[PDB]
């Protein structure tokens, strides 16, 4: 997790996915001054073991694609450091039931 101040070189970062299994992320400084999750509109998200996931799917009879998605370059997706294939349970307040439980897989 490198925290580049103004910007990294195009020659540089072109060396990230070059050391698997391990994985690396890049975060600009001026973009972490305020924790975005902290926002009013931002509801709480949550990761899911390939167990809690392989469950949601059986429990709802879903074909993975039929599940609401979330972007890899999504502000929150990055924050919790998701990956293509991981699921996320969102839990927010609802003026209809009190709390609703939605899920987004990360494409």
């Amino acid at each position: 997790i490198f925290i580049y101040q103004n910007n990294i070189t195009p020659s540089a970062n072109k060396m990230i996915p070059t050391v698997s299994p391990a994985i690396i992320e890049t975060f600009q400084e001026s973009d972490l001054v305020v924790n975005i999750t902290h926002h009013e509109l931002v509801p709480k998200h949550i990761r899911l073991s390939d167990g809690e996931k392989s469950q949601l799917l059986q429990r709802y009879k879903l074909k993975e694609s039929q599940l609401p998605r979330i972007q890899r370059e999504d502000p929150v997706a990055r924050y919790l450091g998701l990956k293509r294939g991981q699921v996320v349970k969102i839990i927010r307040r609802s003026e209809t039931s009190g709390r609703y439980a939605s899920y987004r897989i990360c494409l």
Binding site: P68, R69, E95
Partner: protein
């Protein structure tokens, strides 16, 4: 997105129930980002006969016979176009005579 749409209905005195706006809001949102309710949106998802019944009608078919698309016929539209009962409430199931109980 919701808040903004709501404030557009509500700025007119008219009242609509959450569930409605929400559903719309949700449909635009779910595929990952902000899919617009336009020829360049929903009418561009993995939904051929269907999307063909709105805006790009013909080319939508052309590049459909081109890549040889297969249509479920799971869309309300397909069935209307076919003249079959569509999987809509009343048709979202089957009705069979139980000989045993008969």
């Amino acid at each position: 997105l919701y808040k903004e749409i709501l404030n557009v209905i509500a700025f007119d005195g008219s009242y609509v129930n959450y569930r409605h706006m929400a559903l719309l809001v949700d449909v635009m949102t779910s595929r990952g980002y902000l899919m617009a309710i336009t020829r360049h949106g929903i009418n561009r998802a993995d939904t051929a006969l269907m999307r063909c019944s709105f805006e790009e009608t013909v080319e939508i078919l052309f590049e459909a016979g081109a890549a040889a698309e297969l249509d479920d016929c799971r869309g309300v539209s397909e069935n209307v176009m076919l003249g079959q009962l569509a999987p809509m409430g009343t048709g979202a199931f089957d009705v069979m005579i139980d000989e045993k109980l008969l």
